Amino acid sequence: ETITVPTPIKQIFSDDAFAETIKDNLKKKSVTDAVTQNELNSIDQIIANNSDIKSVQGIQYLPNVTKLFLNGNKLTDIKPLANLKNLGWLFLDENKVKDLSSLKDLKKLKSLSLEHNGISDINGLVHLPQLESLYLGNNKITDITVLSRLTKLDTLSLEDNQISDIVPLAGLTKLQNLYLSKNHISDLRALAGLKNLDVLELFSQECLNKPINHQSNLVVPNTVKNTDGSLVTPEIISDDGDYEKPNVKWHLPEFTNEVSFIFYQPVTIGKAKARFHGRVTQPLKEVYTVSYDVDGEVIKTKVEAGTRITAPKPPTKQGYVFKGWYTEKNGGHEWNFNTDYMSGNDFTLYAVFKAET
């Protein structure tokens, strides 16, 4: 990964924009000018934000780079960085870098910024336990399991992601600055022990429950918990609902596809003050009852309106053959389970049988 003769910058740095970056760094007149390994060895820092760079191919010839500012470019592959053993500060905001495995051998990396990169999988960060600052805001992260190994972090931004489980943070007692706004957090117990926090942000938590059936009298557990595990009393409840601790209750005489409640809780951890504020959203399914009538005996099943009914195993009546399920007793329309949709009301389907042939 070295040049042994004078070589044009453009020959090493194949991305035309990155080549211009090196030319300017070395105070050269043209990307056709030849450079030497000694000149490449002299580069300690590259500042090339918002420079339309698609590839840093060639950077592997710069063994002594310690600081790399590459925010606002068009990068995807960062494999050319893999062996920059002295890299200490890496800023890659607003690119499309997802393959964090290229970082695994950067054991002197102290600060890593990867905001707005579309990242969901950060498991590659397990190989960087020495990190002190990590910026991952505005991504698509759900699973931060790996962060329990990053016991040297004092600054961690996970804001604007999709995180609900923050238990992996519970042991990171060195944290001083923790940005968690715009996630899916409903349970703050994981934060209780972070006694060194100076800055904490917990605004705008959007918590989505799995759908349940609509009912006239609905009950949903309050799942919002403070650092001590106690329930946060709702600030306001949709659809004229009420709080009967520990449950939220509604009377819903007409179907609606959602109820919700909002919560607000001032939080103090260490020296940090925060406002835990968010909404719990409960989707509701519009369900009615299909009654299967088999010669006067009934089995009931609940089905969501506007969906297809899954036909039951057909009845077996000694001496007869099952014909089908019909909308009237001894007559009507034969239900077609592949084309007829569940209606917006309870109704009965009647088993009709026919003679053995």
Numbering used by the authors: 36 to 392
Could you pull the original sentences from the published paper?
InlB, an invasion protein from the facultative intracellular pathogen Listeria monocytogenes, is a multi-domain protein that binds and activates the human receptor tyrosine kinase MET. The N-terminal internalin domain (amino acids 36–321; InlB321) is characterized by a central leucine-rich repeat (LRR) region that binds to the first Ig-like IPT domain of MET with high affinity. The LRR region is flanked N-terminally by a helical cap and C-terminally by an Ig-like inter-repeat (IR) region.
The contact area is between 397 and 647 Å2, with a mean of 549 Å2, according to the PISA server. This crystal contact is not present in crystal form II of InlB392_T332E.
